[PDB]
Ligand binder design. Structure first.
Ligand SMILES: O=P(O)(O)O[C@H]1[C@@H](OP(=O)(O)O)[C@@H](OP(=O)(O)O)[C@@H](OP(=O)(O)O)[C@@H](OP(=O)(O)O)[C@H]1OP(=O)(O)O
Ligand SMILES: Nc1nc2c(ncn2[C@@H]2O[C@H](COP(=O)(O)OP(=O)(O)OP(=O)(O)O)[C@@H](O)[C@H]2O)c(=O)[nH]1
Ligand SMILES: [Mg+2]
Ligand SMILES: [Mg+2]
Ligand SMILES: [Zn+2]
Ligand SMILES: [Zn+2]
Ligand SMILES: [Zn+2]
Lengths: 144, 301, 144, 73, 241, 96, 49, 99, 97, 98
RNA sequence: CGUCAAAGCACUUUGCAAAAGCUAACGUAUCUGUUUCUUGCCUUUUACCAGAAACAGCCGUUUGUAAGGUGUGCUAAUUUGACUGUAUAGUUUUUGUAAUCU
């Protein structure tokens, strides 16, 4: 019936080597910062579009001047301009950088970065000091 | 003329033929079982609904027996086993193995002693906890029914031969047989006092014998006709009234036969669609229980 | 089933019995192509006759004359050269000369009964001693 | 298996030992063993009368030690 | 892992991470658009995620196998495909007859062409519906696939040509069948196959390998059509019933 | 060992123990061992006759203990199952 | 030992520690196998307490 | 040690709070960073020294000092499920091998 | 030693090497036969003293006995409906026709 | 507005993970209350550190042992003592749960 | 690994029932349809465009349980569960500082 499989370590290593063209090489998940699913849900809700991602329909067409008033709140007169508020800000912190924040979704804030680098050659031992790692030298302390 | 809500109550359930249905000795419950490998527990008074199902048996419930404690249930299985079912919790207590064929009948004792017969031509005595036959009796031809006297030394076994054999467990002297039948004995039953033996045989005659150490010969008290057996060779039961003055039996002609134990037929009431396997009487009131191979059982007066 | 020239060579005892299996296939092709002279079910009887004969040939090779090793026999059962279930029936008492498996199954009959060929002829009247409609069997009973 | 008794806090301290049979010995603990075998130096023995006889360096078997007691606050 | 649960063949995407990540730089406009559109479809799929509802196991084939009218055996896939094509052709032919439309010819490639000039009466009577035509076009696609496999089995083409032809068939349904006419919602599947073609070609034709026939990576397009069929099966069964 | 675990549980409380002599000890248990060697504080020694004396720091060897009177509220202490190799009764989460 | 797929050596070594695992447990994912081995070898985190 | 760790240490020592240090994610030294055992020891020691420096920046008292030999530092891997100290391995050895 | 387990939560009297007797509820025991008794009474010589939670040494114990037993189904498919018996006009076994 | 329902639907605003009934622990609750009330075996402290350094996993380690019913989730860490749908969304602690 | 207990066991076919309780992948995959709205293209309908809400369908998955099939066993095989599981006369419990009298 083929409902469960169990493979050895050599077999799995061989299959991983043989199909190496067709799998990702990220292992970190921090790569998808504003380009993950929940950010896309937020962007769809806010009608903004990350410039590499999809574009949908507004989902909220109620923006007519029914109030007929600028509300003397968002006016330039009483606002300190320092930097433009990009849409990346509106997506990363959906509840702070935009009012009318409905149907947005929150995304995972951060993940511990992966510090694994695959070995280049099998001759080297499994546990070996990588020259990329900075040396442990901190003669800059004042202990007891 | 009793506490039943309706004088007649047809009881539905089961998915196959029902082979046994016996009242609780207290008189408030009764269980039934058949070819669907399930035992159902009933409420004699009230809503008359199921509160428990005894699942787990791997064969037809050929026979079952209530315990005096009215808390454990012993069942006879066609799969060569005898299980003890805890009625209150519905869990398998023990499974007595040791036969070599379909075990046809079962009986309990007044003291925790079980007896049974099977097609391997043997009868076995079981302790409620020993899980093994303490005593084995080996016959030439398959046996079909047993009855144990509540005093606790005599067992009556009935088989193909057509002569009831009375065995003393301690003595092992068997030189006393209740001759008179000429065909297979379907069932046996003992009176409340333990003084008379009730037998049914496939020669269509229901006879009554006396269980006394002394007799004036022709231990045959009287015989009854009318209750007939069909061609399916079913094991039709006989019953004893609470006052032991009415004897009852089932028949393959869908009629329940009740007698006065004095030779005159009293009730011949019909109502079943198929062969009537088992019959019993309530120990307190004047109820009668019917058990037939038409997936149904009837409550009585 | 079908084998290529580049496939794993069958066990050692195969080549002695290859020609007779090829001949079995030849007659199967002939029976497939031959048409007419029967009802919608009658024309499909020689198929079962030949299938039973081939499976019986393999069963005879193994279990009565021991002319083949168990590895080759298991290989033959795996490659559908013989019916495993039919042989399983042949190996148990009462079914030594079973014709086919459609004459044993009771769900394919009108009244939930096995085929007529299964009944011993000593219990059968002279008039109703006919050829089975499923496969043309003329008595499967081990007694006969 | 066995276990080392916890007596580091009692090392090099005026200690009082009770033996079996109503014996009583002073001393400063200098060592111990797995079986609570102890070693005492400049110890003093008491009798039932109470006269203090200096007893010397002492190596008590642990099997006879009932209690080990210190007096400091 | 070292231990799993053997998903089905079409439940393994094999290139989903290609477009879940960012687009590689310096790609032409159409490739970037393809990446974005496939990502959009995936996002819409995830947004309307419904926790599956509880239901007892039912399956058509087990119910059919229970009956006495259905038997079972083990045959080659190509033989089964030829049988399915022939049976569908016979069913459509029997349906064209029984209506009197014996002047319409359903040739073996499933084209419905009149054998003579039809009058207004005949032209009005011989007009079929969307269900019949959609089934005819699905049958035509099935015959295309089975005929490619048959060509391979005869030695007319080798394995590489067969894989390339299957990829071409799956990417070019809109040009080979014309099934879009009777159900225009197929254009989602056609656009998806075009986008998969863009990704696979531009990750395939890199370096020494250039432009031309030869790319036979047909798994993604094949599963796209399988997932179209999953939804269209009940609709056609209702319509044909 | 569950009894030794309860003795360790006692630590910090006032436990009464009587030794093979017959004298009972009333003080605060501060340490305990698998051998049941005990350390006590502020002990009120009641000899076999009944004379009352007072001790401050003792180290009673475990081989000379008869029994102990543990404070009552320790009757609800949890009795963990102990596997074969484990030497201390602790909550378990592995195989056993 | 847990990671590198050495069933017999790990089995013998844990037998020396009286840590006994069911035979299906060695055929586990690397990470739950590590968790099981560490929860049997190191018991309750009593050092922290 | 990061910026929030520094802030927590400063505020805790400022308020006279005893500190117990847990060196978490030890398994990443073995399975992820793949350091040899000696380099791993150096990394652990460097982290403890940095923590002690952050403590000393507020009060050079010897009462506030974290070091495994004081039983004040725990090596842990809460994902794999262990948290031991020097004493927890000394006792783990002792239970097996005697007195 | 599986029988030793069966005395948990029972009430036990233990005669000791000294000669006393403790009565109480058994909570846990040990390989060295260290007994933990709850709500323990002392039988000297008989005088009654409440003791409480008591841990016995193994050596102290001589013998023990118990004085008191340990302290302390789903549904069905059948349905009942009243009905009457219907008399059939035939008199023959079901098999015979 | 049309959006306003005439008959308001029944809504239960749940904000945190909160079991209806007390889960079974390895120890008895009366023992814990006795320890808290009449014993000096109680320790009050906080678990603090940097972001994602593992302070909630440390408490999950003890919870796994004292609560046998809890099992690790499928795709992430248990992060017991988060108990806020916002925190379960950001996968980080925002409130100080005792 | 060991002791104890009950269950023949491994593979497999079919039926029946169930599958979030503590915020979470029944399915790391992914189609279709109906109703009510808002849109796009629009000469009228089907077929359509793309967003929402409420509903359904189909392709699959897991578990429990019942009855069978095949291969091997009952003159033993395997599986599941439970377990307060180990030595030892040489001081910290079980191979006796006992008897003596009081
Ligand atoms: O239709 P497009 O996706 O734009 O691709 C077409 C063309 O397809 P058609 O034959 O359907 O027009 C080829 O693709 P196949 O037909 O081979 O699938 C061809 O592909 P190769 O050149 O790789 O053979 C080439 O695509 P490209 O030039 O991107 O490689 C070309 O593209 P243009 O339409 O832009 O010419
Ligand atoms: N590899 C590895 N990962 C760990 C370990 N301990 C925790 N993690 C992971 O570290 C991440 C953060 O764990 P948390 O428990 O949320 O850490 P945290 O301190 O609660 O994070 P904050 O609450 O925001 O401060 C999760 O992915 C944990 O699985 C460990 O010992 N080893
Ligand atoms: Mg946290
Ligand atoms: Mg019009
Ligand atoms: Zn046949
Ligand atoms: Zn036949
Ligand atoms: Zn036949």
């Amino acid at each position: 019936t083929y409902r469960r499989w169990k493979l050895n370590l050599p077999q799995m290593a061989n299959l991983h080597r043989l199909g190496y063209q067709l799998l990702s090489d990220l292992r970190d998940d921090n790569y998808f910062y504003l380009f993950n699913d929940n950010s896309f849900f937020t962007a769809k809700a806010l009608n903004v579009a990350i410039p590499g991602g999809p574009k949908f329909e507004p989902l909220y067409k109620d923006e007519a001047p029914e109030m007929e008033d600028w509300n003397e709140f968002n006016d330039i007169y009483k606002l300190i301009i320092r930097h433009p508020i990009k849409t990346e800000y509106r997506i990363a912190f959906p509840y702070l950088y935009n009012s009318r924040a409905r149907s947005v979704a929150l995304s995972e804030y951060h993940q511990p970065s992966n510090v694994f680098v695959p070995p280049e050659d099998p001759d080297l031992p499994a546990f070996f000091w990588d020259p990329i790692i900075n040396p442990i030298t901190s003669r800059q302390l004042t202990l007891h | 003329t009793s506490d039943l809500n309706v004088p007649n109550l047809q009881m539905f359930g089961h998915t196959a033929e029902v082979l046994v249905a016996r009242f609780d000795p207290s008189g408030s419950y009764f269980a039934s079982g058949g070819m669907d490998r399930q035992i159902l527990l009933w409420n004699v008074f009230g809503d008359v609904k199921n509160y428990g199902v005894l699942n787990g048996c791997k064969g037809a419930i050929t026979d079952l027996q209530w315990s005096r404690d009215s808390r454990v249930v012993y069942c006879s299985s066609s799969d060569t086993h005898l299980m003890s079912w805890d009625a209150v919790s519905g869990q398998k207590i023990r499974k007595h193995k040791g036969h070599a064929g379909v075990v046809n009948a079962l009986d309990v004792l007044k003291v925790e002693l079980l007896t049974s017969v099977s097609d391997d031509c043997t009868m076995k005595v079981w302790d409620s906890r020993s899980k093994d036959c303490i005593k084995t009796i080996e016959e030439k031809y398959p046996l079909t029914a047993v009855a144990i006297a509540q005093q606790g030394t005599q067992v009556f076994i009935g088989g193909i031969d057509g002569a009831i054999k009375i065995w003393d467990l301690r003595n092992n002297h068997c030189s006393h047989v209740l001759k008179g039948h000429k065909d297979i004995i379907t069932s046996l039953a003992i009176s409340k006092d333990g003084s008379s033996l009730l037998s049914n045989s496939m020669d269509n005659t229901v006879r009554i014998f006396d269980v006394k150490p002394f007799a004036s010969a022709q231990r045959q008290l009287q015989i009854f006709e009318g209750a007939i057996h069909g061609q399916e060779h079913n094991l039709l039961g006989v019953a004893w009234s609470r006052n032991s003055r009415f004897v009852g039996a089932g028949s393959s002609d869908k009629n329940v036969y009740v007698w006065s134990a004095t030779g005159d037929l009293r009730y011949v009431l019909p109502g079943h669609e198929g062969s009537v396997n088992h019959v019993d009487f309530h120990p307190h009131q004047d109820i009668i229980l019917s058990c037939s191979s038409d997936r149904t059982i009837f409550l009585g007066e | 089933r079908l084998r290529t020239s580049r496939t794993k060579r069958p066990p050692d005892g195969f080549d002695e019995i290859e020609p007779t299996l090829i001949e079995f296939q030849d007659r199967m092709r002939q029976i497939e192509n031959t048409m007419g002279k029967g009802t919608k079910t009658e024309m499909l009887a020689p198929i079962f006759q030949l299938h039973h004969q081939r499976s019986r040939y393999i069963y005879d090779l193994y279990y009565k004359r021991e002319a083949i090793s168990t590895e080759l026999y298991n290989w033959l059962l795996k490659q559908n050269y013989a019916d495993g279930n039919l042989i399983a029936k042949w190996k148990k008492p009462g079914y030594e000369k079973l014709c086919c498996l459609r004459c044993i199954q009771t769900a394919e009959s009108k009244f939930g009964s096995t085929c007529i060929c299964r009944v011993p002829k000593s219990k059968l009247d002279k008039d109703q001693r006919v050829r089975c409609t499923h496969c043309g069997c003329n008595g499967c009973a081990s007694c006969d | 298996k066995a276990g080392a008794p916890d007596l580091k806090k009692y090392l090099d301290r005026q200690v009082f030992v009770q033996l079996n049979g109503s014996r009583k010995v002073y001393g400063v603990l200098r060592g111990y063993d797995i079986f609570l075998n102890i070693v005492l130096e400049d110890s003093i023995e008491e009798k039932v009368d109470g006269e203090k006889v200096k007893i010397g360096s002492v190596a008590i078997r642990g099997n006879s030690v009932i209690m080990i007691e210190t007096l400091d606050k | 892992k070292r231990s799993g649960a053997t998903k089905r063949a079409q439940d393994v995407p094999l290139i989903k991470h290609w477009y879940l990540e960012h687009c590689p730089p310096n790609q032409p406009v159409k490739v970037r658009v393809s990446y974005q559109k496939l990502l959009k479809s995936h996002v819409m799929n995830k947004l309307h995620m419904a926790h599956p509802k509880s239901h007892t196991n039912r399956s058509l084939l087990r119910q059919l196998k229970n009956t006495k009218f259905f038997q079972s055996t083990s045959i080659d896939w190509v033989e089964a495909g030829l049988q399915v094509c022939r049976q569908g052709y016979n069913m459509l032919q029997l349906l064209i007859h029984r209506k009197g439309l014996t002047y319409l010819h359903l040739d073996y490639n499933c084209n419905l062409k009149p054998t003579k000039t039809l009058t207004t009466k005949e032209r009005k009577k011989s007009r079929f519906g969307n269900a019949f035509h959609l089934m005819r076009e699905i049958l035509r696609l099935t015959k295309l696939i089975v005929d490619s496999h048959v060509q391979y089995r005869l030695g007319n083409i080798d394995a590489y040509q067969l894989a390339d032809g299957l990829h071409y068939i799956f990417n070019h349904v809109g040009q080979l069948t014309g099934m879009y006419r009777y159900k225009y919602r197929l254009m989602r599947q056609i656009r998806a196959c075009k986008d998969f073609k863009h990704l696979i070609y531009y990750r395939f034709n890199t370096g020494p390998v250039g432009k031309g026939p030869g790319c036979g990576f047909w798994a993604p397009s094949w599963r796209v059509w399988l997932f179209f069929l999953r939804g269209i099966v009940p609709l056609l069964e209702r319509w044909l019933g | 060992s569950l009894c030794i675990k309860l003795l360790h549980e006692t630590q910090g409380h006032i436990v009464t123990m009587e030794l093979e002599n017959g004298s009972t000890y009333r003080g605060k248990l501060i340490e305990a061992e698998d051998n049941m060697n005990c350390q006590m504080r502020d002990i009120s020694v009641t000899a076999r006759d009944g004379r009352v004396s007072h001790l401050d720091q003792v180290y009673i060897r475990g081989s000379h203990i008869r029994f102990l009177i543990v404070p009552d509220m320790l009757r609800n202490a949890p009795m963990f199952k102990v596997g074969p190799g484990r030497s201390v009764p602790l909550p378990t989460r592995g195989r056993r | 030992l847990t990671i590198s797929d050495e069933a017999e050596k790990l089995k013998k070594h844990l037998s020396s520690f009286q840590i006994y695992l069911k035979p299906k447990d060695y055929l586990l994912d690397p990470k739950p196998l590590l968790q099981l081995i560490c929860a049997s070898f190191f018991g309750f985190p009593v050092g922290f307490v | 040690v990061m910026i929030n760790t520094t802030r927590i240490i400063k505020h805790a020592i400022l308020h006279d709070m005893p500190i117990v240090l847990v060196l978490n994610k030890v398994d990443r030294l073995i399975l992820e960073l793949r350091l040899p055992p000696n380099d791993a020891y150096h990394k652990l020691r460097h982290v403890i020294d940095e923590v002690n420096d952050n403590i000393c920046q507020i009060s050079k008292d010897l009462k506030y000092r974290v070091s495994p030999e004081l039983g004040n530092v725990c090596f842990a891997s809460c994902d794999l499920g262990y948290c031991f100290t020097l004493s927890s391995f000394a006792k783990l050895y002792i239970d097996r091998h005697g007195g | 030693t599986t029988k030793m387990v069966s005395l948990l939560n029972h009430s036990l009297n233990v005669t000791t090497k000294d000669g006393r007797t403790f009565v109480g509820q058994l909570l846990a025991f040990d390989g060295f036969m260290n007994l933990v008794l709850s709500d323990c009474q002392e039988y000297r010589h008989e005088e009654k003293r409440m003791l409480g939670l008591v841990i016995l040494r193994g050596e102290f114990i001589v013998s023990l006995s118990v004085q008191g037993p340990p302290p302390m189904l789903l549904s069905g498919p059948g349905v009942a409906r009243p009905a009457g018996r219907g008399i059939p006009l035939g008199q023959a076994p079901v098999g015979l026709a | 507005p049309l959006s306003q329902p005439i008959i308001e639907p029944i809504r239960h605003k749940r904000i945190a993970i909160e079991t209806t009934n007390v889960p079974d622990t390895v120890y008895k609750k009366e023992f814990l209350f006795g320890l808290l009330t009449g014993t000096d075996d109680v320790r009050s402290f906080i678990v603090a550190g940097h972001l994602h350094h593992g302070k909630s996993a440390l408490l999950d380690l003890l919870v796994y042992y004292t609560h046998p019913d809890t099992k690790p989730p499928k795709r992430r860490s248990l992060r017991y003592t988060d108990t806020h749908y916002l925190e379960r969304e950001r996968v980080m602690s925002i409130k100080s749960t005792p």
